Design a protein around this ligand. Sequence first.
Ligand code: BAK
Ligand code: CA
Ligand code: MG
Ligand code: ZN
Length: 223
Amino acid sequence: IVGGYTCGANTVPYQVSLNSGYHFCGGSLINSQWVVSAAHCYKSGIQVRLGEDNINVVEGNEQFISASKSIVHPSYNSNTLNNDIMLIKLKSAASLNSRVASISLPTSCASAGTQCLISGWGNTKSSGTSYPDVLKCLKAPILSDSSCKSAYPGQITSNMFCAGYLEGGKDSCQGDSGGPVVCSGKLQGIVSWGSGCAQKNKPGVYTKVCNYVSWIKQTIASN
Ligand SMILES: NC(=[NH2+])c1ccc2nc(C(=O)c3nc4ccc(C(N)=[NH2+])cc4[nH]3)[nH]c2c1
Ligand SMILES: [Ca+2]
Ligand SMILES: [Mg+2]
Ligand SMILES: [Zn+2]
């Protein structure tokens, strides 16, 4: 996250860190046994870490659980990144508490203007590499599809939306991937892609989760 602030230990209790010997992507807990992340975060051998704040220190509120199965969206295109969402089932169900809680899926899609909270342990420098050990947060509004499509001509589909600042300075970045974009209490986006990070007129692009609620509900109930 570039231009964000330290969230505070466990203030985003539904944030997960996907680890395959190191942190490589973020994710969101949707219920005690399932996590939603981005399909471009697919790997084999993933351990889900809940209750994290500093990912380099065991501070006492973590739960490390391995995944039993991963389901990448049936129509995910790795070249355009369209339908960039994946579900992960935990081998055991998490124990939910104040520090580990699930986030709610949306009943409708959010409007341009809506302020959201985006979080992750991704790169914090636009020009450079600096990876934080504690969770970083960023409040950014959803942008109109028009400014999103002008920034990325012929690349934005109906399954994506942009959020951020066209002036640049604030954005999600690699390492935040798969992470949550919560607006009004509902998980509305998943960190998917962008042009570098925090560049002027290059906002972040997120997966539009309101378009996948039936696929999510049907998939977890049948797995
Ligand atoms: N399994 C891997 N090897 C892997 C995992 C995540 C990656 N992520 C990128 C990436 O290239 C990438 N993830 C981004 C997320 C947000 C923005 C943004 N500017 N908002 C830009 C991003 N670029 N490469 C990746 C490779
Ligand atoms: Ca830790
Ligand atoms: Mg994240
Ligand atoms: Zn990524």
